[PDB]
Write a protein that binds this ligand. Structure first.
Ligand SMILES: Nc1ncnc2c1ncn2[C@@H]1O[C@H](COP(=O)(O)OP(=O)(O)OP(=O)(O)O)[C@@H](O)[C@H]1O
Ligand SMILES: Nc1ncnc2c1ncn2[C@@H]1O[C@H](COP(=O)(O)OP(=O)(O)OP(=O)(O)O)[C@@H](O)[C@H]1O
Ligand SMILES: Nc1ncnc2c1ncn2[C@@H]1O[C@H](COP(=O)(O)OP(=O)(O)OP(=O)(O)O)[C@@H](O)[C@H]1O
Ligand SMILES: Nc1ncnc2c1ncn2[C@@H]1O[C@H](COP(=O)(O)OP(=O)(O)OP(=O)(O)O)[C@@H](O)[C@H]1O
Ligand SMILES: [Ca+2]
Ligand SMILES: [Ca+2]
Ligand SMILES: [Ca+2]
Ligand SMILES: [Ca+2]
Ligand SMILES: [Ca+2]
Ligand SMILES: [Ca+2]
Ligand SMILES: [Ca+2]
Ligand SMILES: [Ca+2]
Ligand SMILES: [Ca+2]
Ligand SMILES: [Ca+2]
Ligand SMILES: [Ca+2]
Ligand SMILES: [Ca+2]
Lengths: 311, 311, 311, 311, 311, 311
DNA sequence: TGGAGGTGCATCGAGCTCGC
DNA sequence: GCGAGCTCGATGCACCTCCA
């Protein structure tokens, strides 16, 4: 997919400058074409004279102009949709989780956010014709609730070898919000060498709830969170992966809305509101989407991952 | 297990700065690697220049990058599971109370929350092959309901010398929520010198119900509680201990949910709902877990701690 | 026992600030050590700068850190247990009413709640070797059912001079729930000058049943009751007295549970359920306790207080 | 006895505010001292600032602190006990009906509840040395069964002038439960101008049996009844009158208990169970009391009120 | 006597609201003054704002406060007592059947309950000086045992024109318990236009014995019966009529008590127990009364109604 | 006479609901007007909303309000009285057996109860001017003692064609008490199509003596019997038939009273006590009646039914 | 530049004779 | 001249701030 940053050295850029770009987090020509002038001036060995030269060269390698809605409609027909393991959720999402966008799943506790992320971490490795993305999975966990035993159960359901499923899931544990963002720079490096199909941040806001406390730190909290969601969108456009983040809820005391404020509400393309039903059954509702009508669907958390209820 | 903070003085940090870290609550290199930039700037003799130097040095001592799910699945096979004294609860928990996570036990009065905490305080000292954790226990009591006589009864059941069992249980009585948190900083110091296997906070929310009263203080209450649960998670990752907190219930008037709100619901990895059965028998239900199916099991409070019912 | 608050003026606190503490209800160094930052900021002439200075000084006078369960087991062997006048209840309670905790006695009418409180008000003045507490008694009555003639009958049974027994029983009549709480601040002042062994609130919930009426006031009712039970626990830790509260019942229409809800159920360390037997005989059952098995015992209300049945 | 509310205008309260208190039912300084903050905020022209000022001023006029059981034992020796006309009932009650408390008389029909209330309405006017209370009587009838002809017969027995006996009995007929409570506010006004010794509510629960019907209204019924019994206790503490209420029975179908539930059982200090004997003779039994042993006594309904049986 | 409800429209109530009251069964100002807030909220076009306005206006038209027993003794001297046709029963009842109260007559079959009700239905039309009530009679029959031929025989005895006696007896046949109560609302309407002196319900409990069968319906039976007896008491206070109800007996198998339970025993002011003597002679006994001693009297059922025995 | 239930479909009721009423036993508008709300809720396809609509519509078709005793005296002059075949019994009953009421005939064996029922079954078919009812007869026999040969003998006495007399007597044999009641629902259906004048239940209590045995089943026995007698009264008001039931006797061992207890004694309007005289002559005595004096009369059982004795 | 759930209450209603 | 036991049903209640 994306073009390696080494193509800039052929097009008239010194390899010493390309090295300076890679240490700033740019491992692809697209990542440079998508960056403003500011993000290149901040690098040490890069001046404004080298910036326009770098951007001009990257601009003719990546198409960054106007195009017809007809052409864009053809490219969106080839977008992959990853099955959620539930036949009912796939009808609600009209195919499954969409790559190249940020999908947010929120709900109270035990609503299935970590279980959907575990099912997706396996179903993203299925062939395209089986509803997968035919790529690896990367799981950034911020709570310590990542259980490879759940992956092995989903892998048994689809007849995949559990040993190979675990080998194609990159796992990282974030311990603060700075580490959570620093993990994304390493994610860009890994998405260049091997093909990934899914990026999970579970949860994307849990650490923001305590690294920044009180209204006095509310602004800096939302600024840092907004930068985090921008690099996620960047990873989605750069590598065409599906970004699935998990969010937490808060009570309205004045009946539960997701945390993160307006930053995460605007940034998330699709938002899924998970609520508990009866027993193991749970209800997902389209809370926000550009193309999906507001509807509900009922799924279940079985011993083999997310699936459909028995009745 | 965890590496002492003194290893930073070898790696290029002034011992005067390490002293300043230890007075802020950092007694391990992991505790520094897991902390953001903010928590280090707040210390007096630490500037931003020393912060990145401190974090960079701690970052190469602790692995804080990506890894395969296969490697993580091997480390989770070595996790210890502490027996609850009941053969039925151990099947429900598929082994017992899991270290490195926060387990919440809630229920109405006399449901056995303090009795399970007393049984765990002894069974955490058993050898690994007997279902224990082979370490000391630390009991933070916020109600005054800690009874060493119950420990001696559990110790007689497992053939341990009651005099040595009491010597391996550190006990503290918290009197307010500020003291409850201040006790955790002393807990980190004690977990460095000797090996602990279990940390009990009974109850973790009782003092929040009255130190903060009314909706006008609801936000500050949940903020303080959220910070408390973060340092608990920190103690679990730093020292690999099992954190077992106890929670209280409230009636729904509109049939009893645990207090603490969404903060403690999201933070708790496993939640056990204890309800009363017949006589001395009581029923535990998996209320939340990443890997455990929602099921019930019946245990009993006998004269020798928590065990199985006679029938 | 407890250290007078005047010891803070020696340790570096201005006597004008100590005066401001005493008008807020703090008459002992322990009462200040046990209080959070919030309760000190609310006092007028106390700022945050004086708060940490006050708390730091009080923290080195009162041990508020960790200790071994062995040391705590020695201190609990010296705890006093006050005889209930009945040889059968003392076996059920394994000694009698325990000091330093809150014991709740509930039941329907005429079940003996006021009679046990009258027997305890005398037996708390016996020497330790006779089953007493060797201290005064304080009786907060909220119904007007305090009868010194019953004290004189219990005093004749134990050979005490009735004139001195009545002189060692402080009596107050509470008329509303605000007065009931305001009476506890005067109780702390009186527990400093002379040694008390027992504090009776009969009944602790009767006035809450009518000062707050309906579900619309249910929250404020339980908040006020919870604050009341916290200052009771404070009086028990500060002065090591036995707190014996009396509770009322309500019918389950859907066969009688105590009122007060989950607030008083969690707060009470020991709960005794009194029910009527035959004639003058009545049955007490351990309804909740950290160390006592659920069992029953039969006592009697004779002409000389609570005692054992004739058969 | 009680101090008029006009004493507050001398102590620093505006007479316009005192007027606002009197229209809320407060005609005595004691009635204000005994009221919580809530009952004063509900009055229109009273804010929280005026509330504490009103309560603080009333608090130094009425002793509302601790006292010795010795002092309380002296005040209870001066309590008046009103003769019931029967020499046998006076031995059972150890003197007669006690002022300052609520006495409940219940039984099936024709058991003598209305006849005892008629005898008491006359004997409460006797001099103290003859067993009376030396005050007027107030009779709140809720059934229409008040017969002044019975008062004239009791008056002839004690040699009192029947014309003056009827002049010292205030009579009111209540038609619903709201009217029954509204009558107590007028009772407080009348107890200030002239001295009363007895307040009769016959029957206190008859109208509750039909103004509130079914389990769906059971809660509101018991709430309203509980408020009624609180204002009765208030009238007993404020004016030191004897409150004698009459209650009805219900069959246990599963052998007759009084109606009203646990509300009236806890609130009543003394409960007398009247049952029919032979002919005109009837049996009273102490059903509940703080100081009276459970015993029985036989009385008779003669042509001159309640008296002793011929044999 | 009673004031028409139209007087409220003069005192500041909209005639549309008065119309809404009349369709709820309120045809008199007294009927509104005697009703609680609840009974007015249940009407459709009546809100709480209109309720207090309606009750306040009705409260100053009807005296509903305290009064002296002397004044009440004068009003009870003017109460009418209706002759029972028997000189012996009138001495037993000290005048006859008393208006403004509920008199219950019970006994086994053929004991004369329907015959006394037929004699009363005529004697209530006699002038006052002849022992009557000088008003019409209303006879609610629930058995079909109403015989105008018996009225004509009683009318011949007192020299009244039988054609006019039958014109002054309103007759209704009730077929179920709902119809029995619905008939009382029409009774209130008829008591406003013309003056009535007597209301007969024969029998008041016969239909309750079969519309509600078994213990499973016992509660609803007694609730419905209690509401019926309340509207009877209301008709007695509103219109000053004599309410004479008839009751049935049941055998004690463990020697015959009246049915209806404690509801009808408490509600009935006077209860007459009729038993069979010799031949046509029968014995009435005062079974319950506020002012009448328990005594017996012998009457007879002759060809001209209830009278005295020949010997 | 009675209006068919089909008139409700014209007045605004769905014919599907009318069908549901007819399967519950309601075949006439009167039967619905006479039923309470409860009896309509028990039907499946009938809700409370349809109940009031059904009852309101039936209420304006049947007059169910008050009326004058004069009007009721005219309707009772048109009541039919069926001759008993004996000139002496007709003078005792002042005309004969009265329609629209329940007449009970009891006595020991061979006293003529079954013979009077056979004579009535024929004389009820005579023209009105001959002392009959001009309608059919329905005979519910519970013993097997129905003999059409006795009807033919009575038919010969009155000159009726025996073949037509037997065609106008509907006969049913009841085998248990449930069947005895189930037969009455079919009786209501048959009374709608053709006009009946008499309903005989011989005997109404014989099967109750053995379907329910012992005191343990006494309550359920009397409940079932009471329901049976209510549907009989319903058939009498609905169709204006004469209900003649037969009862059995029991010895008083402590000289023979009828069985059935107080249920059948109250329910029966008229009770005839038959005793044996000399030879074929027997004596009937008015045992209970609203309008008939207690007197005796002598009749005879001849070869042609019940008649007068020869002397 | 959004953030944070809390808290139980209230009992009622009697019915049904049988067997020399 | 004396001994005999069994029977269940029902429901509705609201209010509470503060945060750099
Ligand atoms: N093997 C299993 N079989 C069935 N159900 C399971 C299994 N493992 C976990 N569950 C259930 O999955 C549910 C959802 O848990 P999950 O980890 O998805 O919660 P969550 O939404 O991430 O919550 P939180 O906010 O606490 O992190 C839990 O209720 C748990 O009982
Ligand atoms: N003058 C009198 N002489 C003797 N006995 C009388 C006299 N007046 C009333 N009694 C008796 O007093 C008894 C008790 O009646 P009372 O009014 O006290 O009943 P009660 O307990 O209030 O009943 P209820 O629940 O029906 O109101 C009755 O049995 C009545 O016969
Ligand atoms: N004209 C009359 N002359 C004499 N006695 C008569 C006359 N009419 C009726 N009686 C008698 O009146 C008595 C009482 O009958 P009544 O109708 O009053 O009974 P009851 O108490 O209502 O009975 P039940 O419970 O059956 O309805 C009967 O015994 C009857 O014989
Ligand atoms: N054809 C007849 N001629 C004369 N007498 C007859 C004739 N048939 C029957 N009897 C007499 O009629 C009398 C009454 O019998 P019946 O059937 O009426 O009794 P019963 O009261 O129903 O008795 P049981 O309680 O036994 O059923 C009997 O004594 C019988 O001898
Ligand atoms: Ca999770
Ligand atoms: Ca506990
Ligand atoms: Ca959780
Ligand atoms: Ca008490
Ligand atoms: Ca407790
Ligand atoms: Ca009475
Ligand atoms: Ca009481
Ligand atoms: Ca009758
Ligand atoms: Ca009565
Ligand atoms: Ca026979
Ligand atoms: Ca027969
Ligand atoms: Ca009858």
């Amino acid at each position: 997919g994306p073009q390696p940053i080494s193509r800039l050295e052929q097009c008239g850029i010194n390899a010493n400058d390309v090295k300076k770009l890679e240490e700033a987090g740019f491992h692809t020509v697209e990542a440079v074409a998508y960056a403003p002038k500011k993000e290149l001036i901040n690098i040490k060995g890069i001046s404004e004279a080298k910036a326009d030269k770098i951007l001009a060269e990257a601009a003719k390698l990546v198409p960054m102009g106007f195009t017809t809605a007809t052409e864009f409609h053809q490219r969106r027909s080839e977008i992959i949709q990853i099955t959620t393991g539930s036949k009912e959720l796939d009808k609600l999402l009209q195919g499954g989780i969409e790559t190249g966008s940020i999908t947010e799943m929120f709900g109270e506790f035990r609503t299935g956010k970590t279980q959907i992320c575990h099912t997706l971490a396996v179903t993203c490795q299925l062939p395209i014709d089986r509803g997968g993305g035919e790529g690896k999975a990367m799981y950034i966990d911020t709570e310590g609730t990542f259980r490879p035993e759940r992956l092995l159960a989903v892998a048994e359901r689809y007849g995949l070898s559990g040993s190979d499923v675990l080998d194609n899931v990159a796992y990282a544990r974030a311990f603060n919000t700075d580490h959570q963002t620093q993990l994304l720079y390493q994610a860009s490096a890994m998405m260049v060498e091997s093909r990934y199909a899914l990026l999970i941040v579970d949860s994307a806001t849990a650490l923001y709830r305590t690294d920044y406390s009180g209204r006095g730190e509310l602004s800096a909290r939302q600024m840092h969170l907004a930068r985090f969601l921008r690099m996620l969108l960047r990873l989605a456009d750069e590598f065409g992966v599906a970004v699935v983040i998990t969010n937490q809820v808060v009570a309205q005391v004045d009946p539960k809305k997701p945390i993160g404020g307006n930053i995460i509400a605007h940034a998330s393309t699709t938002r899924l509101y998970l609520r508990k039903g009866r027993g193991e059954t749970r209800i997902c509702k389209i809370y926000d989407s550009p193309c999906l009508p507001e509807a509900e669907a009922m799924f279940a958390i079985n011993a083999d991952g997310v699936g459909d209820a028995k009745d």
